[PDB]
Structure formats: C-alpha cells, structure tokens
Design a protein around this ligand. Structure first.
Ligand SMILES: OC[C@H]1O[C@H](O[C@H]2[C@H](F)[C@@H](O)[C@@H](O)O[C@@H]2CO)[C@H](O)[C@@H](O)[C@@H]1O
Ligand SMILES: [Cl-]
Length: 485
C-alpha cells in the first residue's frame, strides 16, 4: 500500500515575508502550520522573492526574514519547497501584494527598455527580464543568468543548515512571469481577458536580432514576425494566422513558432544548468513550472498555447520537447490544473484542462521525470479534491505495490485562515488522508539522493525529436477509486 502515498504541500501566503522584507506573521503562521501538521501535510511551498532579497543593490542579499520563516517551518516539522522567484508579484489594480523585481534592475530598464519582454505595440512588461538578455552583461556588469546563479548561490550558502537538516527538499526555478516557463502572453495589465488568444511577446530588440540571425541562417533573411495574428482578446477564427488551415501551417509560420518555443526551451536549459551546478551534492530536486493554458486546446491551432511559447498541435507534442530538455538535469515538472474538469469551463473558451493535464503528465512520465501538480484556482470542495485524486493516481490504488504512474507530489494553492477552519479544514484533512492512501504521514517518504551533475548538453535538434510522433496519453480513470466522501 505505501507505494501509493502522494505527498501534499501547501503554498504559503504571497506575503509570508512582508513587502518590506520583514517577517511579520510569526504568530499567525505558527498556529496555521500546526493545523497543517495536524491535518497530515508533508510540507509547504514559498516564493523566495528576488525583489525583496536583492532589493537594495547588486549582491546585497538580505536573507534575514526568510531565515526566521524557515526556522518556523523547521520547528513545525514540515518540509519546504523554495521557489527562486525572479518575477514580480502582483502589480495590477486591486492586487493585494505587490513585489516588483529589484528597483536597481528596473533602473537599468529606464535606459535600456529592451530588457523587458515587449509586445507588437511596444508595451514593456516589467514583471520579468526577457530571455533575450540571459547572456547580455547589462546589469552593472552581470548578465541575467549570472544574477540568477549568484542569487541561488547566496541562497545555498545562507540556508545551508536547512538544506543539511533535510528541511528544504525542492528548489523550483522561476523561469518567467508567475515563475512559469513561458512568455507573458496573457497580461491583465495590457488588457487581456480570458479567453483571448494572447500575443507573441518577442519584440524586444534582443529577440528581434536573434530572429533575424536565425532566419538568415536558413536562407530567409527577409523574413519577419507574422503580422496576421490579431491581438490579445481575439479568437482564433478572427485571425489569418490562427484560423483553421491558417498561416500557422506555412513554412514561415512553422519556422517562427519553432524559433519562439525553442528560445524558451534554451532559456530553461541554460538556467537549469546553472541551478544544478549550484545545488550539486545537496539532497534536493530541481523543478520548473509549466503554465496550464487550457483555453483553445480544442481548436487545431492551440492558439493560446502557441503565444505562451508551448508549440503544441495535434501532431506535435510541445510538452514532451520540454520534458526531453529536463531529462539531463533530472529536473521535475510542476504543472497546474490538477483540480479542473472540462465540464466546469466556458464553452466559448474551447477549453480542455483534463486532456492537457493528461498530455503533460504522460510527457513527463515517458521521459522518466517526476511530475507534480498544483490547483490553478482556489477550491475547497470535495469535487475538486476528487479531481486532484484522480490525477494523482490515474490508474487508482495498486494493492500489490506502487501504481504504474502517480504524481510525485501535489501543492495546494493556498494557505489562509479560510483553509484551516470549519468544513474547509475537514474536507482538506480528508483529502490529505486520501492522497496518503489512508496511511499516516510519513516524513521519510521519497528520500532525495545527493543531486548529481546534469548530463551532457544536447542540441535543440536532439530535443525536438521528442515532438513527433505525438502519442496518445496514458488512459486515466474517469473517477478516483478513493474519493473523499
Ligand atoms: O506562490 C506561487 C506563485 O503563485 C501565483 O502563480 C500561480 C497561479 F496563481 C496559478 O493559477 C498557476 O498559474 O500557477 C502559478 C504558479 O504557482 C503567483 O502569481 C506567482 O507570482 C507565485 O510565484
Ligand atoms: Cl517514444
């Protein structure tokens, strides 16, 4: 029975550390974490905000608030998943917690605005640095990759006790907006609203130059970005690029989609190589986050996936390519939408979260990766928990041993007083029991080996062999065999 146990993590509040980098929720969190421990929870997850820690200047890392938080987590006996959060929290009207990237990095942007992902109207998104400047030494002598590596190194050095005591077990490497490996193709501040197709965000001058060079290398120096792509809130059939039998299928369209999605894959590969070097020998797993772009999954162009940077079509597996890049690093995939049913979505949105989840999980498993999930939206109800259960163990309980497939972990978004009171808490506690296959909490489940070095670098052409032939997902049971009640 024990091989069936799936760990449950809870995401801490976005301001677990205050926006002024002080640890102010000691009393509240201590009581809330006792409730999580009483409910069987294995660990918690927390954003380690770049804008808080490196806020005062280059290499002026102030870890003091995070240390107090971590001591609290250790004293509660919980495991911890740390997100290297190189992105902005919040920043839209009505957002409760606003934590930009460091001011001194934004200051560089006032002179070089092309450090930001830029759309076709020239709007600069300030939430993350363009993959275009990964290797450009624009930041008081450092490149973006060097800044990420130095931050991670400082983290390792300062949190060494927590790593050595087995408190920190997972490092999630932020690779874009919201920590997700994607482009900022659906920004509420630029006027996107669900279920718009989004936009290609490759207009910064660094990426424009990258494209020109890539185009000339295949004998087409004239070529340019597609301009028949509509705008954020269009539907696919209103554009010549995304409509059925549209120009996404042309030679030019294919080259551009590959260039755009490949750049994201290369961004992840190079940052994970540095992260691996940082954490070499520590008993931690590295993970990336893949966003769940379920809208337009039911139309042939998969338009919203394409603009996010996931080059996924009926005959092209744009998630298995990503999984193949992760293989050498022994990095895990953290996906979302674990809680969603297709029947819960708007019909206009052409949305298939269940099929998307099955595709991403099956891609990870076929590459031998650990796969974990999160819920996309707040849910407290049994149906949601049953949906997660189904995804956690797609073939149900195995009586004999471990199941053929299961999630390595599930992380619940997110902790607050609402979760640890009333019927919510009762539903949640019952969920954790079921995730654990009705066994008591085992803190020593899924032990980590010392992190080995990433295997040999493989080329983009090698990675892309994983795209085709596109395989059907593994079959998933329609309903969990171990429901909450
Ligand atoms: O606290 C982790 C993370 O949470 C948010 O992003 C998540 C989205 F809310 C969710 O819908 C899905 O897309 O997964 C995201 C990653 O966990 C915050 O917006 C993000 O800044 C923060 O790092
Ligand atoms: Cl295969």
């Amino acid at each position: 029975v024990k091989g069936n146990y799936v760990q449950v993590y809870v995401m801490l509040p976005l301001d677990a550390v205050s926006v002024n980098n002080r640890f102010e929720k000691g009393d509240e969190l201590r009581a809330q974490l006792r409730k999580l421990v009483e409910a069987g929870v294995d660990g918690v997850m927390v954003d380690v905000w770049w804008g808080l820690v490196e806020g005062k200047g280059p290499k002026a890392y102030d870890w003091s608030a995070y240390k107090q938080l971590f001591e609290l987590v250790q004293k509660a006996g919980l495991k911890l998943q740390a997100i290297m959060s190189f992105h902005q929290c919040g920043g839209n009207v009505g957002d409760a917690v606003n934590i930009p990237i460091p001011q001194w990095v934004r200051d560089v942007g006032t002179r070089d605005p092309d450090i930001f992902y830029t759309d076709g109207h020239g709007t600069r998104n300030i939430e993350y640095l363009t993959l275009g400047v990964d290797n450009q030494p624009l930041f008081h002598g450092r490149s973006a990759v060097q800044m990420y590596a130095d931050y991670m190194t400082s983290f390792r050095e300062n949190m060494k006790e927590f790593l050595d005591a087995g408190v920190i077990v997972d490092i999630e490497v932020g690779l874009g907006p919201a920590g997700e490996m994607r482009y900022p193709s659906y920004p509420q501040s630029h006027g996107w609203s669900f279920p718009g197709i989004g936009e290609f965000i490759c207009y910064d001058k660094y990426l424009q130059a990258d494209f020109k060079a890539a185009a000339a290398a295949v004998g087409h120096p004239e070529w340019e970005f597609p301009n028949d792509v509509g705008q954020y809130n269009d539907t696919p059939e209103r554009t010549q690029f995304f409509r059925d039998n549209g120009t996404y299928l042309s030679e030019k369209g294919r080259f551009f989609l590959a260039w755009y999605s490949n750049n994201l894959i290369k961004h992840g590969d190079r940052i994970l190589d540095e992260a691996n070097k940082v954490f070499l020998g520590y008993k931690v797993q590295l993970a990336i986050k893949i966003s769940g772009i379920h809208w337009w999954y039911k139309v042939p162009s998969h338009a919203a996936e394409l603009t996010a940077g996931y080059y996924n079509l009926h005959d092209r597996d744009g998630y298995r390519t990503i999984a193949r890049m992760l293989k050498r690093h022994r990095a895990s995939i953290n996906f979302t939408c674990a809680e969603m049913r297709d029947s819960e979505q708007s019909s206009q949105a052409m949305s298939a979260p269940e099929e998307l989840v099955q595709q991403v999980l099956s891609a990870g498993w076929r590459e031998g990766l650990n796969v974990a999930c999160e819920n996309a939206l707040p849910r407290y109800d049994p149906t949601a928990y049953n949906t997660i259960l189904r995804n956690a163990r797609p073939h149900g309980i195995n009586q004999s041993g471990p199941p053929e497939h299961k999630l390595f972990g599930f992380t619940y978004l997110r902790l607050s007083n609402q979760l640890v009171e009333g019927q919510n808490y009762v539903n949640f506690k019952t969920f954790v029991d079921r995730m654990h296959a009705n066994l008591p909490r085992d803190p020593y489940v899924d032990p980590m080996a010392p992190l080995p070095r990433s295997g040999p670098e493989i080329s983009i052409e090698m990675i892309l062999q994983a795209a085709q032939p596109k395989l059907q997902p593994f079959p998933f049971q329609e309903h969990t065999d171990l429901p909450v009640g």
